[PDB]
Amino acid sequence: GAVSTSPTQSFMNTLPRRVSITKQPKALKPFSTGDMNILLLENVNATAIKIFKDQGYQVEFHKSSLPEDELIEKIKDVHAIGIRSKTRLTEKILQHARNLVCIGCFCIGTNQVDLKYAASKGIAVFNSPFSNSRSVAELVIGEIISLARQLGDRSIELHTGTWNKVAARCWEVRGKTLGIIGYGHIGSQLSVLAEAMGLHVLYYDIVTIMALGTARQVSTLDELLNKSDFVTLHVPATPETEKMLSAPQFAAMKDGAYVINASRGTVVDIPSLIQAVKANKIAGAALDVYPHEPAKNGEGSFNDELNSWTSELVSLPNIILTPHIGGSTEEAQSSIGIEVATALSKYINEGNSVGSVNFPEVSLKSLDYDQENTVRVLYIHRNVPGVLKTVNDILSDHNIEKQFSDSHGEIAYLMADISSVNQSEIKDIYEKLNQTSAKVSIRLLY
Amino acid sequence: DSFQRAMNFSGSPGAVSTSPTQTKQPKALKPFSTGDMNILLLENVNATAIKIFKDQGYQVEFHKSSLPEDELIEKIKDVHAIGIRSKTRLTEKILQHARNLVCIGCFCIGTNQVDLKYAASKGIAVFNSPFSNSRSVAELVIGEIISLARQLGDRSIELHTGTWNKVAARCWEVRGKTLGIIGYGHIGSQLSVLAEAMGLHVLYYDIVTIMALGTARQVSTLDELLNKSDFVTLHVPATPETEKMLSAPQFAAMKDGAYVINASRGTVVDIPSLIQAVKANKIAGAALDVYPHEPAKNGEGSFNDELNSWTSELVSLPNIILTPHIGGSTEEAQSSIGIEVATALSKYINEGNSVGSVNFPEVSLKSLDYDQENTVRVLYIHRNVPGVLKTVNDILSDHNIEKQFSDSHGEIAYLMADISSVNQSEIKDIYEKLNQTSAKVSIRLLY
Amino acid sequence: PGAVSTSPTTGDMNILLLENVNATAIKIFKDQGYQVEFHKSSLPEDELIEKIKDVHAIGIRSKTRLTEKILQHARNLVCIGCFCIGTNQVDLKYAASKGIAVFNSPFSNSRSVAELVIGEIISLARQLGDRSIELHTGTWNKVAARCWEVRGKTLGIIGYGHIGSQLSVLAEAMGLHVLYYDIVTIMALGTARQVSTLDELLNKSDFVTLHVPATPETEKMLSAPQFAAMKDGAYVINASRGTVVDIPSLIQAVKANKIAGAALDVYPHEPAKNGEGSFNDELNSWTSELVSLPNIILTPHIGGSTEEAQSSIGIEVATALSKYINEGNSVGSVNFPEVSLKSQENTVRVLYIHRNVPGVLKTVNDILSDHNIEKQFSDSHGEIAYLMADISSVNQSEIKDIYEKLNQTSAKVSIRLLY
Amino acid sequence: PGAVSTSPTQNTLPRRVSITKQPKALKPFSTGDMNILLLENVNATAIKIFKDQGYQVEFHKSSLPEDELIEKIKDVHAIGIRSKTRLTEKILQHARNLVCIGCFCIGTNQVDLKYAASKGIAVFNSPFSNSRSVAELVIGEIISLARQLGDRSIELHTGTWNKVAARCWEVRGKTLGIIGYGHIGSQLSVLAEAMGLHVLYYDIVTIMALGTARQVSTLDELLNKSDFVTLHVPATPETEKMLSAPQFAAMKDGAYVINASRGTVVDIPSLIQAVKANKIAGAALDVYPHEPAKNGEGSFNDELNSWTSELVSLPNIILTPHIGGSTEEAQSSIGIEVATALSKYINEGNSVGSVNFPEVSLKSLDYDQENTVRVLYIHRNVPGVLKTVNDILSDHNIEKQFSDSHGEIAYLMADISSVNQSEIKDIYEKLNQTSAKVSIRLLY
Ligand SMILES: NC(=O)c1ccc[n+]([C@@H]2O[C@H](COP(=O)([O-])OP(=O)(O)OC[C@H]3O[C@@H](n4cnc5c(N)ncnc54)[C@H](O)[C@@H]3O)[C@@H](O)[C@H]2O)c1
Ligand SMILES: NC(=O)c1ccc[n+]([C@@H]2O[C@H](COP(=O)([O-])OP(=O)(O)OC[C@H]3O[C@@H](n4cnc5c(N)ncnc54)[C@H](O)[C@@H]3O)[C@@H](O)[C@H]2O)c1
Ligand SMILES: NC(=O)c1ccc[n+]([C@@H]2O[C@H](COP(=O)([O-])OP(=O)(O)OC[C@H]3O[C@@H](n4cnc5c(N)ncnc54)[C@H](O)[C@@H]3O)[C@@H](O)[C@H]2O)c1
Ligand SMILES: NC(=O)c1ccc[n+]([C@@H]2O[C@H](COP(=O)([O-])OP(=O)(O)OC[C@H]3O[C@@H](n4cnc5c(N)ncnc54)[C@H](O)[C@@H]3O)[C@@H](O)[C@H]2O)c1
Ligand SMILES: O=C(O)CC[C@@H](O)C(=O)O
Missing domain, CATH: 3.40.50.720 (NAD(P)-binding Rossmann-like Domain)
Structure with missing residues (x-):
């Protein structure tokens, strides 16, 4: 009913990568x-x-x-x-x-x-x-296509002498929909690749996340399971992701849809996936991660003693199994x-x-090349009262240009830049800080 | 003289100048x-x-x-x-x-x-x-590029038999690598755009100059492509020139640990030389959709040493993807x-x-409207000799011909004519006359 | 699609x-x-x-x-x-x-008009014309009120033809959302959306632009009721035809502050020639009214210039x-009928323009019957028809013979032979 | 004869909403x-x-x-x-x-x-x-200048009908030269490519191009090859009158100049002269050497800038009153x-x-950090002040602290735990009577 201000917000004015014309960082030696x-x-x-x-x-x-x-x-x-x-x-x-x-x-x-x-x-x-991130995103693009065309099955057949040309239920990935669960570093990277391969991308996350490209955030996982041809997982291992794809989620998915898990070995209930595939509900799956994985490479490592459903899983069509090679x-x-x-x-x-x-996360802007006589104090100590009192007393003859301390549990970390310090005074500061009682470890860079 | 004003012609003063620019229902008819x-x-x-x-x-x-x-x-x-x-x-x-x-x-x-x-x-x-x-083959190739780069096929076959073998060595991200496309046709040009989107550089060799899609580059020789490519893929026709166009000397021109993909034609790769290049660790993997000899039907002992003698050798090699002509399946x-x-x-x-x-000759005419009552379409297939349109247009000469198109293809020609104001008596008369011309091969009338 | 199924193509x-x-x-x-x-x-x-x-x-x-x-x-x-x-x-x-x-x-x-419109969208959105006219007469008037970035706004295209569809892609690139109304179902370019009624387009658009032919249906298709259906402070652009907008109603919508600005390339009456007193009350009576209004861009039919x-x-x-x-x-x-043929020695092409009456192809194909006709195409358009025939193995003696025979047929309008 | 080998490796998240702990809200x-x-x-x-x-x-x-x-x-x-x-x-x-x-x-x-x-x-x-507002203004002025829209409208508003296609152009295929590929320049770049212009840019720094824009090493290469030249630079001594008579001579016949950067960056008397000589076909200016302080009716005239009456009498000149961001x-x-x-x-x-000011900040305190105060201590960058301050606070654990300096001023921000209301007033009054103090607030 009225023309009116669009939703504009200042953080969307970005700048491309450039070359600063900085001052040379002073290099510092302990x-x-x-x-x-x-x-x-x-x-x-x-x-x-x-x-x-x-x-x-x-x-x-x-x-x-x-x-x-x-x-x-x-x-x-x-x-x-x-x-x-x-x-x-x-x-x-x-x-x-x-x-x-x-x-x-x-x-x-x-x-x-x-x-x-x-x-x-x-x-x-x-x-x-x-x-x-990129290595896992590319793996998934490859498994989407490989599952869509039963490549693994074709090759295994031919390697044993069976010629089995099949177009039935093999698909062009263009036009299909990818459902990404977890729009993080991997999920967002996969999103852009998947759009380039002509998939429509939906994602479910527990947080509101700005989409890349023309991906769409869906408010429930069941919308995603309902509307996706390929479902892929890029979530952390939390109690909420523990077995988050199980029998009820496979029932919410489309007939002949596909499941990909290169996130964590716990996030899929495998007995329920096996059963969904056997019922022809799920048309194929690719797994990079399992509940139990061997400690080392070896020849009989992946078997019923490691995960009991192994012999069942292996006997199924259109299953791609990889040994945690997402980042390899x-x-x-x-x-x-x-x-x-x-x-x-x-x-x-x-x-x-x-x-x-x-550790506490502490840093300070580099000193310039031409800041002569400046020292950096790196003081790791016990997170108890009275320690900055002690330290800032020891340094009180010199101007402190800047200082940052933070704590993490029983430990804290101070970093201070002090100016106009000669080599005699440096040794004096070091020995004083080295005999404070809150001290865990100290280093001075000059 | 007028040759200075001619080198400062196709060059210019510096001047702003014009850019380089560049319903009715069909009547349904029954025989x-x-x-x-x-x-x-x-x-x-x-x-x-x-x-x-x-x-x-x-x-x-x-x-x-x-x-x-x-x-x-x-x-x-x-x-x-x-x-x-x-x-x-x-x-x-x-x-x-x-x-x-x-x-x-x-x-x-x-x-x-x-x-x-x-x-x-x-x-x-x-x-x-x-x-x-086209799209089906281009997607297959993108998937085999990745699959070969990561030895996916080998990993899965291992795991399916109980072997856990995590390997990063010589396994690669395809971002940054170079794809060499041999044959920049319908499939090659489509693959080009996909491959760039997956972050590969694309070079191509063709026997003709072809305008690149995106930022692909045409190279003038195949050996330049073989020299500079990590993945080489073939999308060429079966000609005598493509017959075994990748053989031992071409594999020597390729990079150490490069990859070969053939979903074009069964003849274009010399397989015994590929087998030998893989065995020498020159070629790191390969994907084949097509073979010199293929079975006529699907079956269980169809792909073996009796069909192609190097089968048992080929199958025993690492990082080989074999598919049964499923490029377009x-x-x-x-x-x-x-x-x-x-x-x-x-x-x-x-x-x-x-x-x-x-x-056949390629002939067609705009559809007649729904409401064009009494119009017939003559479809006259005949021998391509003089005097046939004379005969036919004589037979039709009592009726106005709204339009007509005849074309020839060897010894055969095809006339298609739309004639108006024809009743059912006259239709049968035209049919029987055209049916007893001597140039006639086959005739049909649609109304 | 409750099951994985074949994709559209x-x-x-x-x-x-x-x-x-x-x-x-x-x-x-x-x-x-x-x-x-x-x-x-x-x-x-x-x-x-x-x-x-x-x-x-x-x-x-x-x-x-x-x-x-x-x-x-x-x-x-x-x-x-x-x-x-x-x-x-x-x-x-x-x-x-x-x-x-x-x-x-x-x-x-097409491109020339589509670019004009992109320019008028921006120019109207920021009152550029008004700013410049002010400054040219010494008035400094910096104004942010009711001036907008086109990004995020919605463009309503009436007529998604050659110009409309081209404009669509430009407008999306400038970050406008595009709706269009047409009397035909047309597949959208990009992420433009076809709306089933004009009133929905008028209701939801910030900028409305017209790219339609002059038909009785487009005659004054934007009038007082359409301007009432539009948003307060929306904008109107017409570089289609001089009749498609009712100008007295536009003038009135602007005067009521309903319409915030407008650009017109076309008028009910236009001068025959360039000249200095050509655009005035004697040509269109509302001229003096129209000219005295803010944020009106007037161009003299330069959409394709x-x-x-x-x-x-x-x-x-x-x-x-x-x-x-x-x-x-x-x-x-x-x-004329639309006829053509794919473009060695001794072949002639006969171009026979004739009256569209029975018996003419009989006559012509008789005259040519000593020679093989490789191909032939005739079509009609009213009282006229046009035959084009390619005949092989013809020497120059035989060509003159065919010409004189065809030149004395009674259905003939004009003939030319190409060899 | 080659070997396949590791690509040259160079991971963000898209913007998202935090599901951290609720921020404790703080009152002075x-x-x-x-x-x-x-x-x-x-x-x-x-x-x-x-x-x-x-x-x-x-x-x-x-x-x-x-x-x-x-x-x-x-x-x-x-x-x-x-x-x-x-x-x-x-x-x-x-x-x-x-x-x-x-x-x-x-x-x-x-x-x-x-x-x-x-x-x-x-x-x-x-x-x-x-940024976006200026970039869109420029796209509009490109088209407007290319088609002499302003001139057409002024004519018609006075009753002159003057249909002209001569030296009027489709901007598709033309080249835009951007001087200064910053926030505005880089945004304009993407718009201009979408409108079908080829984009060149000159900057004093090497900047990675957006899209298919190309950085040129000299300004005269840009002036030589551009149909439209536009300025998005700061006011430095180097940009002061950086387009003058010699730069207009380096440009194409019938090219166009746009300046919505700074009022000093173009030499206007030389632009006027280049237009009068038919070298420059049109120009748009948003900014001038002298601008009025307020809106008004006789503000833009020969007393403000002497070439005003000359400038205004020229064809295909768009003048705007600093509305780039309006x-x-x-x-x-x-x-x-x-x-x-x-x-x-x-x-x-x-x-x-x-x-x-010194740029200082600390992560928010959680909702459940009961009894924590934040000390905001603005003082003088002289030795011995953190000694004094950290002494005053030494009965309490300091969870974290950040001080930084900017000239003669510094700014300390400290989060201290287990402080009741009695102790808060005591800390405030002690810090308020330190000699290095410029101003102090406590948030609790
Ligand atoms: N297979 C491998 O070899 C391999 C290699 C690398 C990473 N990974 C794993 O992949 C996963 C993703 O890595 P990443 O860097 O993209 O993670 P990330 O932390 O960048 O993002 C994970 C995403 O999951 C979302 N999320 C968390 N809980 C969720 C829930 N319950 N439902 C839906 N979304 C939820 C988060 O909001 C976030 O967007 C991790 O488990 C990581 O360890 C595996
Ligand atoms: N694997 C399958 O199931 C499958 C499916 C579809 C098509 N194909 C085959 O893929 C190939 C490509 O098909 P297309 O539709 O892209 O064909 P196309 O005719 O459009 O393109 C072939 C290109 O190869 C080029 N070319 C010819 N000889 C060459 C040579 N010696 N070296 C380099 N380039 C050469 C041509 O110039 C042309 O540009 C054909 O053999 C086709 O039958 C296979
Ligand atoms: N101002 C100029 O100098 C200039 C220059 C070129 C073209 N034009 C004019 O612009 C207009 C569009 O030209 P074009 O090349 O796009 O034509 P076009 O025929 O391609 O487009 C007309 C479109 O409008 C639709 N349409 C017809 N009647 C309609 C109605 N009543 N309501 C809604 N949609 C309707 C049609 O179905 C079609 O998609 C025409 O009037 C053309 O003559 C003006
Ligand atoms: N007209 C208005 O109302 C308005 C509105 C906003 C901004 N501006 C002005 O527009 C200009 C651009 O603003 P911005 O946010 O893009 O600035 P920015 O600081 O992001 O970009 C300026 C660019 O100029 C480059 N540069 C500096 N000196 C140069 C020189 N001599 N030659 C070439 N390039 C040079 C810098 O390296 C940088 O890339 C500034 O002057 C700003 O004040 C005007
Ligand atoms: O080209 C002309 O002569 C001007 C009028 C023209 O636009 C037309 O009638 O199509």
Whole structure:
């Protein structure tokens, strides 16, 4: 009835990637310490080895994990350690790590590390949560097509001599609808690929999320299950996602629809999927993840003793099974290398703990090249009253340009930039802070 | 002199200048011959075709496979149109018995299963569907690119037999990789756009200069494409030049750990040389939809050393995807073929329209309006000799001819004429006169 | 879809060009080797008569009247090019009666009009015209009130034809939502939506624009009741036809602050020529009223007045006349049957224009019966018909014989043989 | 002869709603109600955001005489202005309660930023809210100039019918040269491509193109190859008169010039001369070297800019009075940006995006952090102040703390737990009598 102001809101005025004309960051070196020793285990990617050697750190590399007694001896001298999933950094092991500044988990998982014990010794732990997104999104595009045309079945037939040309119930993916459960890093990336392959994209999330492209958020999962040809899961493991696709969800789906799970091994009830496929309700499925997975690669590893429905699952048509290869590419392993090595490096060189999984997240803008006589104090301490009183007293002869402290449990982390400090005064500040009683670990960068 | 004002002509001062630019209802018609229309459909044509024919009111007989030769002969005696696919062989042996047949539908690309020349000689028009499977093949390839990049087939076969084998080594994200398309035709150009959207660089080789879609680039030699591509895929016709165009020297021109995809034609790759390139770790994987020798029917021991001798060798190799000519085996493709060919046969029967025919002159005329009473359409198939239009236009000379179109194709020609103000007495007279001209091959009148 | 299911899917030829047709046309004709005479305006009737007695093709635009009085003297004329949409300046029936084919350019101005509208949308949304007129007379008047970003607003297109569908894609790219009303079901481009009633479009649109023909149904189709159906402070654009809007009712809707602005390219009465006192109360009585209103953009029928449009007309019509002369192709002709044939030695093409009566193909195909006819196409248009036949193995002696025989048939209107 | 190998690897989320813990809402100590004063007809979106916080809001459509402004500002905690209200030291000296200033506009020169910072007063503005509005204006002027729309309409409004297709063009296929590929330039780029123009841009920085725009290394390459040239640059000494006689000579015959950036960036006498010589076919100007302070009837004339009578007598010139950002949507977005900024500064102490202040903020306290106070301590960047402050707070655990400096001023923000109402008053009075203190608030 009246022309009127459109819904416009200022955060939608964006700017493309450009080159700053910044001032050179001052490079900072620790007090009293010599060479940084990095130990990398479990065949971390060469991108990581390179980033560390270019800093001038000494790097020791291993393709697998170490026996516990060998790991103990090596870890005594080491300043940073990179691991993946199979190295268990327990208190038994970390108690001997007198020099360790940080731990890199070159992977998503961090449970192999006793995070709380580590924090208690002032050891920051970093990981790579989102480095595998593109690899999983592409896997799914490939499985959509592969399921749509029963590729796996065709190839297995031909490899054993059966020629079975079938158009019945095989589809062009253009025009079909993809239902994405969880519009996160993977879900939103998959959305754009799926639209490019000519699918209509619906998504269900527990949060209101701005769509990419022409994807549509649906308010209930049953709308998504009702209207989707392909349903795919990109959710975390929570109690709410635990078995969130079970018999009633498969009944809500279309006859001859398809199910894809490269999220978490718990999110699908497999006995109910097996039964939905056997009833010809579900036309095919692709699983990358299972309730129980072997610890190592091997030849009889995937069987009825690991998951009891294995012999049933294997005997079904149009089932694609993969052994957790969602993120298993050279590009992903290489990006993890860069993300985590860069993270450890910024923590060592600048004290930046943003993205740490067990630590307060603290950082400060870099000092300029030309800020002569400025020191950065990195003070990890016990989260009790009276500690900033102590510290800011010790530093009170010098102007503090800026300072940031934050806490995480029983631990806290102060970072302060102080100006006009000569080398005599630096040694004095170090020894004073080193004999405070709240101190867990201290480092000064100059 | 006037050659400076000619190099500063196709160059310019600098001037703003013009950019480089660039209802009535159809009357439905029925033949003069009594007894309707029998359609025979073989080899499991799609339901879209069955529906189009029944809605015309034709009597339709449907079969899911082909017939023995003796059964096919007896059925074809009464039939007015026959739909087939690749495995029904309409030889002269069979078509000699087809006294009523007006047209043949090939619900597929190939027409070699039909003796097209014998058919044309009897005034039988043949129709097919060349370009209906394009999207289906392009999507197959996108899926095999990813599947090969990630060794999906190998992973699944392992797990189905109980082997857990997680591998990132030489498994890749296809974003950033380069796709080399050999043959930038209907399928190649479609695949190009998909591949860019999946974040591949696309190069293509063709024997002709073709305008790129998107930001694909044409390379002048195949070896440049083989040198620069991570994935190589073939979308070419079967010519003597494409016969074994990827052999040992082309695999040596390719990258270490590159990939080969062939959903074009069974002859275009030399398989013993591919087997050898894979065994030497030169080629990291391959997907084949088509083979030199393919079984005639689906079956359990059909794909073996007796059909192609290197079968047992090929199957024992890692990261090999084998499919049984399923490039165009989708519901959407089979359904579009259904509609294209059944619409074509239907317009040929109801209106005489032979456009898109593979063995016939291509002739058609605008539909007559609903309300054009007393108008007949003459469909006269004859021998392409002088003096035939003289004869025909004489026979019709008492009636105004609203329009007429004749065209020739070899020894056969096809006249189509719309004549107004014709009563039923005069119609029978025209029919019997045209039916006893000596140039006549077959005649039909629609009113 | 409650189950996964299938998805949807030659230097003898004299050309005379009048009224300043575009150079693209002059070039196409000279590259054929035709002799070309060009004029920037039209000719007096007596001069036109003398020139036309030898002309084989004539190009005109809107102001040259090819009456029977003039065409009766055109002994050589094969065809007429209208380098424009309109053809009423030509007596089409008399022309057809002499075997003269007439061609025009209906759809060459589509992009030019669609861009004009995108510009007027923005200009009206921000009162640009008013701002500039103010400043040109010294008034500084910065105004944000009721001025809008077009992003998010809705465009209502009446008539989703060549112009409407082109405008649709532009408007979406500028971030408008597009609704359209047409009297026919038309598949949308992009994410435009067809609305089943005009009143729904008027109710839901911020900008309303007209791209319809002049029919009795479009005659004054936007009047007082349609402006009442529109939003307060909505906008009206008419670059279709001068009759389609009731202007006194638009004036009244603007005066009542119902309509916030309007752009008109077309009027009920327009001057014949450019001039200084041409647009006034004697031409349309509401002129002084219309002019005194805020946020009204007035243009003098410039919707298709670009270099690119004039240039495309040049190419379309000159190519058409050229294919008619060189190949007999009459497809796109406005007053003639539409006939053409796919374009070695010893083949002739017979072009026989004749009276549409029985017995004529009998006569003609008799005359040609010593020679094989490879193909042949005849069609009719009223009292006239047009045969085109390709005959093989013909030497120049036999060609002259066929010509003289066809030239003395009684149904004949005009004949030409191409070899 | 090649080897397949790792691609060159370079993950966001789309905007989403948080399902965190409910933010604890915080109220200042010694203060009662927050009074907001809004001048110069700020948009209703701002009035609404402030009343929903429960602030008392006084609104005016214009600016105030200096003596009235002085009296009102004595009580006021936040003031919103636009370009014409001059907040000098003369006026701000009497601002005993003022916590912050909103500039509901891009410009902040009307405010004495340094004096303000010296009294602990944070100033906020809206730099980039007008981008889309300017980009659309330009698309409209491109078309309007290409078709001489303005000239046609002026003619008809006076009774002249003048149909012209000569040197009138479809913009499809033409080239747009964007000088300054910033917020406006990059937005315009995408629009222009959609209207079928080829886009070149010149910038002093390497900027990744949107779409199929192409960065050119020199300005004269852009001037040489463009049909339409448009300016979206800041006022620097390098942009001062950056289009003058030599740049117009580098441009195409019958090309077009658009300036909705800054009033100084084009040399107008040289543009007038290029148009008169038929070098430049048309121009649109939104901005001038001298502009009137207010709307009025004889404001734009030879006394303001001497070439006015010359400029106005030329064909195909579009003149607008600084309306690049004058839309409902732009004014409304400014409303939201600045009112939200002032509100977060008042309610949470967040000074990020401040133009004259250290940029400090802390994650919100949870609903269930009972007995926590937030200390907002604006002081002098001199040694020994954190010693004093962290001493005063040393009976309480500090959960977190962030101090940063900007010249002679610094700003500490500290979250302290387990504080009852007795102890809160004690901390306030101690911090209020520290010698480094400029201003202090506590939120609890
Ligand atoms: N298969 C593999 O090898 C592999 C590799 C990488 C990641 N992953 C897994 O994939 C999943 C997604 O990774 P990501 O980075 O995209 O996650 P993300 O955290 O970026 O996003 C997950 C999404 O799930 C949504 N969500 C949470 N609970 C939900 C619920 N109950 N219903 C619906 N939506 C819900 C969240 O709102 C969010 O949008 C995780 O489980 C991750 O560990 C697996
Ligand atoms: N696998 C299947 O089920 C299936 C399905 C459909 C089509 N096909 C086949 O795919 C192929 C492509 O079909 P299309 O529709 O895209 O064909 P098309 O005719 O449109 O394109 C083929 C292209 O190959 C080019 N070409 C020919 N010889 C070449 C050579 N020696 N080197 C490089 N380029 C060459 C041609 O110039 C042309 O541009 C054909 O063999 C067709 O039969 C297979
Ligand atoms: N101003 C100019 O200089 C200029 C230039 C070119 C064309 N035009 C005119 O613009 C108009 C549109 O031209 P076009 O090329 O798009 O024509 P078109 O014939 O392609 O489009 C007309 C459309 O309007 C629809 N329509 C007809 N009557 C209708 C009605 N009563 N209500 C709603 N829809 C109706 C038709 O079905 C069709 O889709 C015509 O009048 C044409 O002559 C003007
Ligand atoms: N007319 C109005 O009402 C109005 C409205 C909004 C903005 N503006 C003005 O428009 C301009 C653009 O605003 P914005 O938000 O895009 O600015 P921005 O700061 O995002 O972009 C300016 C761009 O200019 C580039 N640059 C700087 N100096 C340059 C030079 N000498 N030559 C070329 N490029 C140069 C910068 O690198 C940057 O990319 C500013 O002057 C702004 O004040 C005017
Ligand atoms: O081209 C002309 O002569 C102007 C009028 C023209 O628009 C027409 O009648 O189509």
